[PDB]
Design a protein around this ligand. Structure first.
Ligand SMILES: [Ca+2]
Ligand SMILES: [Ca+2]
Ligand SMILES: [Ca+2]
Ligand SMILES: [Ca+2]
Lengths: 22, 140
């Protein structure tokens, strides 16, 4: 059921990792 | 791919697709990020979605969410945080109890047996708990 943790992780990275686009 | 990565890549989707209409919006993403203690501008949410939106329809479907998960290398610093976040009382070990709490903060109201199996699956040294290294492997 590790599904959701992976997502929080990713998206967290995503948010900073996308926000290195501003 | 595992029968197992199916239900797994699936739930991940379900974290965002709160209505389950099948596609992920800025609103949903946004609500998810606020649950995580962040507060992204409208432009950031769009911007986050844009990088994966293969078909340019401003939303994110299941396969585009696979584009998300597969794409994003500074892992350790983000994971040492995750550990810290889980280890509520920071004794160095994550208990079943502490695991319950986390799954819940994400919305997954789990059978206790699933939570124990979760622990049982990441527990390398067999002490009932997940310590940092075990966490590192559970996560990577
Ligand atoms: Ca949706
Ligand atoms: Ca789309
Ligand atoms: Ca602990
Ligand atoms: Ca252990």
């Amino acid at each position: 059921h590790m599904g959701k943790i992976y997502a929080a992780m990713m998206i967290m990275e995503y948010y900073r990792q996308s926000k290195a686009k501003k | 791919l595992t029968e197992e990565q199916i239900a797994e890549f699936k739930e991940a989707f379900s974290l965002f697709d709160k209505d389950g209409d099948g596609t992920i919006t800025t609103k949903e993403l946004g609500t998810v990020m606020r649950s995580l203690g962040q507060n992204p501008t409208e432009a950031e949410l769009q911007d986050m979605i844009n990088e994966v939106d293969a078909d340019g329809n401003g939303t994110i479907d299941f396969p585009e969410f696979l584009t998300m998960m597969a794409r994003k290398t500074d892992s350790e610093e983000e994971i040492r945080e995750a550990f810290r976040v889980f280890d509520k009382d920071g004794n160095g070990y994550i208990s079943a109890a502490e695991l319950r709490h986390v799954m819940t903060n994400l919305g997954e109201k789990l059978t206790d047996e699933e939570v124990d199996e979760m622990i049982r699956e990441a527990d390398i040294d067999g002490d009932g708990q997940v310590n940092y290294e075990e966490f590192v492997q559970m996560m990577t």
